[PDB]
Design a protein around this ligand. Sequence first.
Ligand SMILES: [Cl-]
Ligand SMILES: [Cl-]
Lengths: 210, 216
Amino acid sequence: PKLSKDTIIAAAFSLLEKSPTLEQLSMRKVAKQLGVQAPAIYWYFKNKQALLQSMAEAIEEHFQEPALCGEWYSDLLAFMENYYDLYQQFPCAVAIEIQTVPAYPQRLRHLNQMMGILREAGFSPEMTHLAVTSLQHLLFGMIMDATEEKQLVSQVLNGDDYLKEQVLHMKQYVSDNELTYMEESIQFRIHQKSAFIQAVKTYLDGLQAD
Amino acid sequence: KLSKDTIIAAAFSLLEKSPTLEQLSMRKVAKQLGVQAPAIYWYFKNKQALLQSMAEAIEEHFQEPALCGEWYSDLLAFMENYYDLYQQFPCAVAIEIQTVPAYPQRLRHLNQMMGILREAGFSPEMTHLAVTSLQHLLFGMIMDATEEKQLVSQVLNGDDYLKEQVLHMKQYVSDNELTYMEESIQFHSIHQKSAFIQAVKTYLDGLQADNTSSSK
Ligand SMILES: [Cl-]
Ligand SMILES: [Cl-]
């Protein structure tokens, strides 16, 4: 029956579903989403950063704890797979992680968990850190690449003279220059999630080697 | 002093001060030049055209690697060099991500990195997965580091809120006895080119046993 942090966070995400651009998320907008005035949002949030911190924490809460089996490879795999599902459930999820500091217990214990799995498995403190942060990097860059390329492909398929023109120029160049490999590369889009798992298993196979 | 090169530069300068591509507008580029939007449009039909041109401008600066014919080594050279290229331009990752690779330089590089793998025996789908996964690694790697230095700056220049958050983080690690997160602290480190180089090698190491599992 009254304004709460939760009511605002939901409105923020609701706002992102409409306009999936985190930089466009302003306090006034979030206010108008609730039919209120910006000043009201500030009673619960000092600035946009405080709102982002809460949103990030909100996302973490939806993470599904993976079923661990004691195998460092599978377990870490289960973790990354579940983060892939999570980041696929909220708009700008990656940008939100990127733009905030993990100052919430939930996110911290997951990171500590993934790292321990590797440390307890015999990996160097430096190598477990590289591994875990590297896997996050792969997911971050893949999710946004996919998010931004989905839009581009949509604009092209939605009659967009310019980009369409760009796409044709691209395909002609590849052809006129017999760029075989790039040519077959276009073919794939390639099941996204499946691709991600393949990339991690590959990284994981590399750890196992040395 | 108006020309594509001048517009392009003004954009990058604009981003240097505030490396958030989402804030780049035709109206802001014009202001940066001391002109109004219409003038700019005579050079670019829209923001997307400016980005395409900016993506090209970035690729043109790609230092051609010296290859020897070995897939592991040559592919590593390409990534080391792409890592250097993305340290020279603000928002290089976001720009390549929000543009289609229709410019020559890009196509030549993508097709040739994929050529390194295909000729070495890697299946078409593993070559694609490998080449794009390495780019994904670098992209997330560079975006994460970019915000990092920005947040670090904000804290230092007196941002009390963020300073408080960094503090809370450490309090939780201690309150919940997060032993591994604590040791994780001593890593500045996982932001250096060698960390990226180590990440790429671990991936190429996996490749010597994957989709090699799917090769031949
Ligand atoms: Cl975003
Ligand atoms: Cl426009």
